[PDB]
Design a protein around this ligand. Structure first.
Ligand SMILES: *Cc1cc2c(nc3c(=O)[nH]c(=O)nc-3n2C[C@H](O)[C@H](O)[C@H](O)COP(=O)(O)OP(=O)(O)OC[C@H]2O[C@@H](n3cnc4c(N)ncnc43)[C@H](O)[C@@H]2O)c(*)c1C
Length: 468
């Protein structure tokens, strides 16, 4: 590699091909989708990120930044062999300021973000539950978690960013400075260079936040009206509730979080309990860091910073951003789950999240206000199929997950639905993926791309192509 000798001569730290250091940074989270970079740069400073980008641009090699490496389709590698991969997980600084603003390096994992903001000032951001997820990939495409309906997606509290452009030039952007770049980073942020700092307006970390679960005993006769009643409750429910429906061969269960105490949560859910019949709510009030710890899972490191991070799964996933569904659409879905899902040997599961409703912060911005387009949808579905670490993923798994999703999406009006770039689907056609993830924002994203990455060095198979 001329690109490797360029990096060494620019005093950019790199991993030697085939070494233990290469295996540490260069093993994709998803064991189904390993990739072999041309080079792995391991910068500790913004100056080293600039030099690494300049080296890639000079040699015409595709460049991919990897923060936490949780991409379901290994897009931090580029979703193919041969990129210059810029490993960012050595840069995990979280700095909270007295005015409640925070400057965070994207290589900080969500558990480290939550731990540092909690300990520095009892502050928080609206991010998802896995603690190992990088804040870079998460916030640049959305970031949905247990307080989304009150505080928005992670990117809804972003107020600034620092980006290494594909020239190596370091720029600042905000609503008031390079606002076109700042728009694109807030939902399509892999496309425009390496983000090396994100600035946010934190919120006060709740002293009292209640997690809750509702165990259900549904079948093909009760599940359609139960899912419809769940959805209808979600449309009107207060911003303090974020919740989801989990579904697998084991049946149906509600889980969520409520900003407030247990008594208030039980009063707020009583109409949904009355819709269902014969259910009990389980609920526990904790503080914010208690809530983060609870959803991390038993025995998971809630504050991961080590370069030796090595979480893995072996899986295929897909998603659906959907408007409100009819009860007939829920019947089609439950029919698929009760027949094809029930008889499947696969360990599949899905979540149906309420992202919208009258009071939701996620559905407050218009679709065009950020690159994140799915502001008009009520539901976010995640579909997941996993096999053991030492199994090969079977191709009938693609058809199982496609069938689960299409049991809903094949009945929806064209242009009213899509997919979530944080839950990317490897099997979709390349340009159909760009429309699923960014919808009506694609045209403006292509113009931003033509301005900031005209040579399309920051590319992957599902990424935005430059068009002025
Ligand atoms: C593994 C995992 C993923 C989860 C989990 N829980 C989630 C949740 O509760 N809510 C969510 O909204 N999402 C959840 N996800 C999915 C993650 O949000 C996505 O998997 C994120 O994309 C992961 O981010 P990260 O770990 O940083 O992944 P990478 O593979 O490094 O990058 C993803 C993507 O973004 C680009 N990129 C990263 N960093 C940068 C920077 N600094 N600049 C530019 N571009 C960047 C990559 O190139 C790639 O395209 C729970 C679990 C267990």
């Amino acid at each position: 590699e001329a690109v490797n000798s360029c990096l060494t001569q620019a005093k950019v730290p790199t991993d030697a091909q085939g070494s233990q250091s290469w295996k540490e940074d260069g093993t994709a989270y998803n064991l189904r989708l390993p990739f072999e970079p041309a080079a792995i740069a391991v910068p500790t400073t913004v100056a080293q990120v600039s030099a690494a980008v300049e080296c890639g641009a000079k040699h015409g090699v595709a460049i991919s930044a990897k923060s936490g490496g949780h991409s379901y389709t290994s897009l931090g590698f580029g979703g193919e062999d041969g990129h210059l991969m810029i490993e960012l997980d050595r840069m995990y600084s979280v700095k909270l300021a007295k005015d409640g603003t925070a400057k965070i390096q994207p290589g900080a994992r969500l558990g480290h973000v939550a731990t540092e903001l909690w300990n520095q000032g009892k502050r928080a951001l609206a991010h998802g539950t896995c603690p190992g997820v990088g804040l870079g990939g998460h916030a640049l495409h959305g970031g949905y978690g247990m307080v989304a309906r009150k505080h928005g997606l992670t990117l809804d509290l972003m107020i600034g960013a620092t980006v290494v452009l594909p020239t190596g030039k370091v720029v600042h952007c905000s609503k008031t400075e390079n606002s076109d770049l700042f728009w694109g980073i807030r939902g399509a942020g892999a496309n425009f260079g390496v983000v090396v700092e994100l600035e946010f307006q934190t919120f006060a970390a709740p002293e009292k936040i209640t997690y809750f679960d509702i165990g259900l005993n549904w079948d093909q006769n009760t599940a359609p009206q139960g899912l419809y009643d769940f959805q209808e409750f979600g449309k009107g429910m207060p911003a303090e509730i974020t919740m989801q429906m989990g579904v697998s061969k084991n049946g149906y269960s509600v889980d969520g979080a409520y900003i407030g105490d247990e008594a208030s949560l039980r009063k707020a859910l009583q109409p949904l309990v009355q819709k269902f019949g014969g259910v009990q709510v389980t609920a526990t009030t904790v503080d914010w860091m208690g809530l983060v710890t609870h959803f991390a899972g038993a025995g998971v490191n809630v504050n991961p910073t080590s370069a030796s991070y090595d979480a893995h799964d072996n899986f295929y996933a897909s998603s659906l951003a959907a408007p409100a569904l009819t009860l007939a659409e829920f019947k089609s879905f439950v029919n698929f789950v009760s027949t094809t899902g029930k008889s499947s040997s696969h360990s599949w599961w899905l979540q149906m999240d309420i992202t919208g409703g009258t009071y939701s912060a996620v559905s407050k911005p218009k679709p065009s206000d950020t690159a994140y387009v799915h502001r008009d949808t009520l539901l976010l579905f995640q579909f997941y199929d996993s096999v053991a670490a030492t199994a090969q993923y079977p191709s009938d798994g693609f058809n199982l997950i496609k069938g689960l999703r299409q049991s809903i999406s094949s009945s929806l009006k064209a242009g009213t639905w899509g997919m979530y770039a944080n839950y990317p689907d490897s099997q979709i056609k390349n340009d159909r993926a760009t429309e699923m993830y960014w919808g009506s924002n694609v045209a403006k994203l292509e113009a931003v791309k033509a301005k900031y990455d005209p040579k399309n060095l920051f590319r992957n198979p599902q990424s935005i192509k430059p068009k002025a």
